[PDB]
Amino acid sequence: SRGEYVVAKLDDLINWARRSSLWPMTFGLACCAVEMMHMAAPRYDMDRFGVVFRASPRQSDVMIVAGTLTNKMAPALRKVYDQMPEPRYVVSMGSCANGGGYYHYSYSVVRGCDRIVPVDIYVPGCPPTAEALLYGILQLQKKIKREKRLRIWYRR
Amino acid sequence: TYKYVNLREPSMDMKSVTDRAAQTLLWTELIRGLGMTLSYLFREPATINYPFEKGPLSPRFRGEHALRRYPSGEERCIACKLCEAVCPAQAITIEAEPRADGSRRTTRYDIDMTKCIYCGFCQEACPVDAIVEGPNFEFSTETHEELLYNKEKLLNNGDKWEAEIAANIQADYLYR
Amino acid sequence: GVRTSPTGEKVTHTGQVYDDEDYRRVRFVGRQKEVNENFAIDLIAEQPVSQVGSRVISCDGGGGALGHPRVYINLDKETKTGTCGYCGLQFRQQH
Amino acid sequence: FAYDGLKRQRLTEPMVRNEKGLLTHTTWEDALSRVAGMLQSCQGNDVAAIAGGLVDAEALIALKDLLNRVDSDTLCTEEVFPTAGAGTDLRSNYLLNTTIAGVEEADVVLLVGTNPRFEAPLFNARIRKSWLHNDLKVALIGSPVD
Amino acid sequence: LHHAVIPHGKGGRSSVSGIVATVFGATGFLGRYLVNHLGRMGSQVIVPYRCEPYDTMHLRPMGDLGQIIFMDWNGRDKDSIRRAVEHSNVVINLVGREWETKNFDFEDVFVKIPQAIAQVSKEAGVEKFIHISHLNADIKSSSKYLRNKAVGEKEVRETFPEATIIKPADIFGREDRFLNYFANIRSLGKKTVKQPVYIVDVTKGIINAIKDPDARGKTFAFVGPNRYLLFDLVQYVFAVAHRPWTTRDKVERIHTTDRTLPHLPGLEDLGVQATPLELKAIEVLRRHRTVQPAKTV
Amino acid sequence: PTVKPPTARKFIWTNHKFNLSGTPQQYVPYSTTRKKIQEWVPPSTPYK
Amino acid sequence: TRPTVRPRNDVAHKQLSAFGEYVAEILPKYVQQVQVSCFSELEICIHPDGVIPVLTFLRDHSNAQFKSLADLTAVDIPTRQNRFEIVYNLLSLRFNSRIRVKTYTDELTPVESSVSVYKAANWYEREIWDMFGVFFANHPDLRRILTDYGFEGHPFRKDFPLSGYVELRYDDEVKRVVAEPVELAQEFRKFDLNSPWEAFPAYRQPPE
Amino acid sequence: TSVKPIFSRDMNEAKRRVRELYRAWYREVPNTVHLFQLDISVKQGRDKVREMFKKNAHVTDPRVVDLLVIKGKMELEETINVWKQRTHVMRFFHETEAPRPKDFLSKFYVGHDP
Numbered sequence A: 001s002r003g004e005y006v007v008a009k010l011d012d013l014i015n016w017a018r019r020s021s022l023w024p025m026t027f028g029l030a031c032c033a034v035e036m037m038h039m040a041a042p043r044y045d046m047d048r049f050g051v052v053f054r055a056s057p058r059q060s061d062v063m064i065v066a067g068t069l070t071n072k073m074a075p076a077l078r079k080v081y082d083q084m085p086e087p088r089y090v091v092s093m094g095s096c097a098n099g100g101g102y103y104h105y106s107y108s109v110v111r112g113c114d115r116i117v118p119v120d121i122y123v124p125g126c127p128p129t130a131e132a133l134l135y136g137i138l139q140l141q142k143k144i145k146r147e148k149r150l151r152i153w154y155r156r
Numbered sequence B: 001t002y003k004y005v006n007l008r009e010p011s012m013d014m015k016s017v018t019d020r021a022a023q024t025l026l027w028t029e030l031i032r033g034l035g036m037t038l039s040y041l042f043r044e045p046a047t048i049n050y051p052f053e054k055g056p057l058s059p060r061f062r063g064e065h066a067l068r069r070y071p072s073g074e075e076r077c078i079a080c081k082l083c084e085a086v087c088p089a090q091a092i093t094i095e096a097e098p099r100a101d102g103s104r105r106t107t108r109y110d111i112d113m114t115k116c117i118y119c120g121f122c123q124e125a126c127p128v129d130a131i132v133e134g135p136n137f138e139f140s141t142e143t144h145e146e147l148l149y150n151k152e153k154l155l156n157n158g159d160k161w162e163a164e165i166a167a168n169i170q171a172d173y174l175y176r
Numbered sequence C: 001g002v003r004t005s006p007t008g009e010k011v012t013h014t015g016q017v018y019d020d021e022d023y024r025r026v027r028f029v030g031r032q033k034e035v036n037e038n039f040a041i042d043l044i045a046e047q048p049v050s051q052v053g054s055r056v057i058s059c060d061g062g063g064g065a066l067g068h069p070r071v072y073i074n075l076d077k078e079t080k081t082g083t084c085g086y087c088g089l090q091f092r093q094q095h
Numbered sequence D: 001f002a003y004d005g006l007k008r009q010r011l012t013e014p015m016v017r018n019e020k021g022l023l024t025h026t027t028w029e030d031a032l033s034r035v036a037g038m039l040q041s042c043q044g045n046d047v048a049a050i051a052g053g054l055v056d057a058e059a060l061i062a063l064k065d066l067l068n069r070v071d072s073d074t075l076c077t078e079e080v081f082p083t084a085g086a087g088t089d090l091r092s093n094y095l096l097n098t099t100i101a102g103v104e105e106a107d108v109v110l111l112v113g114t115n116p117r118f119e120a121p122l123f124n125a126r127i128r129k130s131w132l133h134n135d136l137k138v139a140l141i142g143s144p145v146d
Numbered sequence E: 001l002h003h004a005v006i007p008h009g010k011g012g013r014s015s016v017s018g019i020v021a022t023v024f025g026a027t028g029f030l031g032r033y034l035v036n037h038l039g040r041m042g043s044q045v046i047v048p049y050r051c052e053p054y055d056t057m058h059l060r061p062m063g064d065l066g067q068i069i070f071m072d073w074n075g076r077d078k079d080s081i082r083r084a085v086e087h088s089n090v091v092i093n094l095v096g097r098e099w100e101t102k103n104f105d106f107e108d109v110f111v112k113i114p115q116a117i118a119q120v121s122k123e124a125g126v127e128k129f130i131h132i133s134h135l136n137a138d139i140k141s142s143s144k145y146l147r148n149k150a151v152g153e154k155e156v157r158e159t160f161p162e163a164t165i166i167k168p169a170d171i172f173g174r175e176d177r178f179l180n181y182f183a184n185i186r187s188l189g190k191k192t193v194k195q196p197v198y199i200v201d202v203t204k205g206i207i208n209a210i211k212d213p214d215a216r217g218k219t220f221a222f223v224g225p226n227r228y229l230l231f232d233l234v235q236y237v238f239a240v241a242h243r244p245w246t247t248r249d250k251v252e253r254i255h256t257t258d259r260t261l262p263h264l265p266g267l268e269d270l271g272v273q274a275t276p277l278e279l280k281a282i283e284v285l286r287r288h289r290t291v292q293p294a295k296t297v
Numbered sequence F: 001p002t003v004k005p006p007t008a009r010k011f012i013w014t015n016h017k018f019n020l021s022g023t024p025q026q027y028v029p030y031s032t033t034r035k036k037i038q039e040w041v042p043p044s045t046p047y048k
Numbered sequence G: 001t002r003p004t005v006r007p008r009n010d011v012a013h014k015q016l017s018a019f020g021e022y023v024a025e026i027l028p029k030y031v032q033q034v035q036v037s038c039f040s041e042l043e044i045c046i047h048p049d050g051v052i053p054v055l056t057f058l059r060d061h062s063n064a065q066f067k068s069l070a071d072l073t074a075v076d077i078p079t080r081q082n083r084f085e086i087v088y089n090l091l092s093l094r095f096n097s098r099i100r101v102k103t104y105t106d107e108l109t110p111v112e113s114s115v116s117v118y119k120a121a122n123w124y125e126r127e128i129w130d131m132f133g134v135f136f137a138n139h140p141d142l143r144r145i146l147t148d149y150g151f152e153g154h155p156f157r158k159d160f161p162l163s164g165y166v167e168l169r170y171d172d173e174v175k176r177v178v179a180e181p182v183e184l185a186q187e188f189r190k191f192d193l194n195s196p197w198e199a200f201p202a203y204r205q206p207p208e
Numbered sequence H: 001t002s003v004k005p006i007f008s009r010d011m012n013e014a015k016r017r018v019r020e021l022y023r024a025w026y027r028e029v030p031n032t033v034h035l036f037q038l039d040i041s042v043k044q045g046r047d048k049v050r051e052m053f054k055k056n057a058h059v060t061d062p063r064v065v066d067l068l069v070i071k072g073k074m075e076l077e078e079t080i081n082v083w084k085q086r087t088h089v090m091r092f093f094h095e096t097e098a099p100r101p102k103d104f105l106s107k108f109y110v111g112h113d114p
């Protein structure tokens, strides 16, 4: 119908604007912070995608969990995720954020950040390269591109 | 065999004192810093055009794991569990048995890619070049269990990437 | 050399397939069961048996340092061919 | 090598008879209730017990105390030992009283009615070691086995 | 019983509870805490979702890996219902709307879709089916909600005769539409008597109804421990919240007294101690803060 | 590979595939072993 | 033995043996053993009552001047009745040398805090409280430094398991990160690696 | 049998330190329920304090109860200073944990544990 066409074009508009202006809050926990900083470094340059360098956590769009989540910092991660306005996304960078990694069997490590927050992109590596992290951010943008918020709203 | 950083006593004649006062009032070093930033403004940036331009790698690069085969279709892995014995994160889970023609072959070859530390001790422990850590780094997932590889996924990665993996091993096996 | 269970599920080169009353098929609902369709037991059986004139043959798998460790296969039994324990290539004394 | 029989034919779940007379899977509550409802109706010689060949002593005294609560002494084994005379009262008349090690101290071994090669293969291995090193004289009463 | 569905572990996150659940309407208020309480035992939860997958993301940390299977479905597509339920050993229905929409009236949400879910669950061989009615569901009710929910309860009973049908009165929690409705109304006081039940009590009731083989074919009435008049309840809500979207069908249900059904079993017959509202109302309404308890009957 | 082509093998995929995550063609993990313990199937005949 | 063997340093071995005799005869009240390894490191094994008199001496004697505390360590050896082995590593920048002062305690005997000698120790032995449960008396602010705030037990004890007893997850019911008894989806696979053959006959212990 | 003390020469000074620690926790509990904005009552938190003290009431060694008073003061110092979050205070109340089977019969039903 006509309303189906209008909500299709408006979903395309809002998804274009949300994926083309992603603002990350990076948790610089461990070694993956260095490779996030290389994804911001002038070779890869996240800012040319509209992905700014160090937005404040009250205005960020994605939470990049870059490093080991210990048990002593799991509620801090949860509190920052609760303070993020929607639509918020979470990229899990590297093996300790993904599944505990090299510290999986430790007494003090959350076995993957997915026990604390919902995770949208899992970027594997130890550390994953800055090109691999930029790949994960572009896959997150493609995930935002195919969101159907107003179309499902028009069908509900 | 050592040197003194910042042990210069500055000259107190009217020439040097007037030089430092002109630097203070007329902001000469601030213009120097502005000039260096302006000099980078007119340089070509170092930014490659990802995804269309890729970062440089080498045949030693340790990316996505793969199980390899012989040049006959037979898989190289003969179930010796050296890779999971050397595995520093215990990402590899192996169960084996003799198959229908009596060969020593695995029935479980799991690699948890979210325990894996990507150090490639498995591919240097491997005596038949069966497990390799191949060249792929662009294999991010939307779900955690899509990074829990079984034997089928690793053999499919080997069949997918063998044309590149074999040439990287051909480039690097003389250093090994 | 893949085949299929009566549930419509592919059977792996190991032989793994879920039962019909196993709930764990629900993980492939809306998705796919990933199997590899190049079964190595069928591919090594396509290789022709190598006729050699010696009594003991060496095999390293081909490629020299790129193959497996070089082993020595006896070929005195004429009932059975001599199989490489690593690569599965089989040999026969031609006499 | 009999450890692979330890994963075939295994009883994993409680089973009861259905309305059609077939063993169907059930919970522990249903199976133990249907056994206890019959055990409460029994008394005296109404309930007995046969212990098998692989049963630990803990389950043996468990089933003995359970049937003694219903006043039943009929707890039996499948392997017959004669209760004539002293019976199972004194331990000496049903043990290998010497030892397995005491075979090395013997000089005449008399074997009656047994094939100790297959009934107790390392008791036979100890007999052969005493045969070989101590010049043991062995005699057999029974069929001429190897 | 199949070997993969025998319970193992100590009942934690990596355990196996032996419960393979298809929870329709798992993206709501009740489905949130039900999928939480199922996923912490180690249950295979199938969540069929209608909405955007973003709006399901909060269900993902609730279980171990592979223990929540998200899949698309539609209320008017029985093939998707069969695609969701044909591996489960229990199917819980939680589909509901407080308002009728352009595409789904109260008869679609309460009569058509529960009968469809229960019929496809009957013919696929699902062992247990739990359906959630409302306590005040009546054919001669003043509100279309309760009329269609009584009709749908009758149809679920006649198409899945072993269905555990559960009657909650009024559910309160952090994401409710009962105390958050009263805190954001800033309609009146009448002779309406209510006994509201807590969401963790309802969730423990649903899980104990899964585990109980006696709960097949029963009808349970989940009520709170204290009956309140509506006026002093709303005054207690404005007192705890530090205070001085609607429709007329919602107002008809607010002014419906919570009926007394003593012959139906409740939370105590499943082993759930019903939490009084004075223990949890502070937890619910702390967010609305920028208190002597109410009188019962 | 126009100058130096890769070494041809019969098991190498003739069709390359991109990252299939988020699609119905994606990898789903599973145990590749068979069943460890065999259960005793009771007799289907009656016992009287 | 030229290319692949580590060359032995005999001058440093002689000098460290002589200085070990020196320390053992200046402080006979506390020094229990003095030993020098084959790679030329001096260990002074003392009684735990002399943590402050020995370490002040090495800090202040004109022929010691161990002005640096490199590292402070505990080692849990459970077959010893004094199962914790407190290891001080000292550096003399003047004499270009390192010394090791080892002592002992169990769970209940407090070690005297060495913060009055080296302030460097202020966190280190605090770590020894957190990881091992060795109490340090007259410490300024003794509390945990590395474990989580509600942590029970001391992790670097060897009877403490590799994973803990509790693990965290976010729970949406209570809206809170919660602690639960630990379950692993894959148990840590214990590998028995030790060869049944003797490797070093120079380290053979006498039999019983 | 002659050991070095920590703070207490015998059990009398030790019980005095236990008693002062219980006093300090009893005084602290309403401030803890307020500033962490816990969803419990002061009676319930003080019952948890009493439970944690009476759990260790079987100990007859002065050094062990000295270290228990030391660790209780460390817990209290981490609670007065807001070093714990709400999560660390509520880990004493095992709220998300299912109740364990206590009798023989339900432990027999659920698994192999004694």
Ligand SMILES: NC(=O)C1=CN([C@@H]2O[C@H](COP(=O)(O)OP(=O)(O)OC[C@H]3O[C@@H](n4cnc5c(N)ncnc54)[C@H](OP(=O)(O)O)[C@@H]3O)[C@@H](O)[C@H]2O)C=CC1
Binding pocket: A156, E024, E025, E026, E027, E028, E029, E030, E031, E049, E050, E051, E074, E075, E093, E094, E095, E096, E097, E098, E104, E108, E109, E132, E133, E134, E135, E167, E168, E169, E170, E171, E172, E177, E178
């Ligand atoms: N106090 C209470 O809330 C009480 C509730 N109940 C009943 O309990 C159940 C759950 O309650 P509650 O959590 O509050 O409900 P919610 O409004 O919070 O959510 C209901 C769920 O049903 C889904 N749903 C609704 N309409 C449709 C439809 N047409 N097709 C497919 N899915 C649909 C929603 O999915 P989506 O996210 O896509 O919209 C949502 O997941 C309901 O059946 C309700 O009638 C009974 C008594 C008291």
Ligand code: SF4
Binding pocket: A030, A031, A032, A033, A066, A067, A068, A093, A094, A095, A096, A097, A101, A102, A125, A126, A127, A128
């Ligand atoms: S996944 Fe590995 S490399 Fe990355 S931050 Fe963790 S420990 Fe460092």
Ligand code: SF4
Binding pocket: B083, B086, B087, B088, B089, B090, B091, B092, B111, B115, B116, B117, B118, B119, B120, B121, B122, B123, B133
């Ligand atoms: S790369 Fe290292 S951590 Fe990963 S599987 Fe191989 S040995 Fe294990």
Ligand code: SF4
Binding pocket: B076, B077, B078, B079, B080, B081, B082, B083, B084, B094, B122, B125, B126, B127, B128, B129, B130, B131
């Ligand atoms: S991959 Fe290599 S090291 Fe690992 S079991 Fe197979 S043959 Fe052995």
Ligand SMILES: [Zn+2]
Binding pocket: C059, C060, C061, C062, C068, C084, C085, C086, C087, C088, C089
């Ligand atoms: Zn070969």
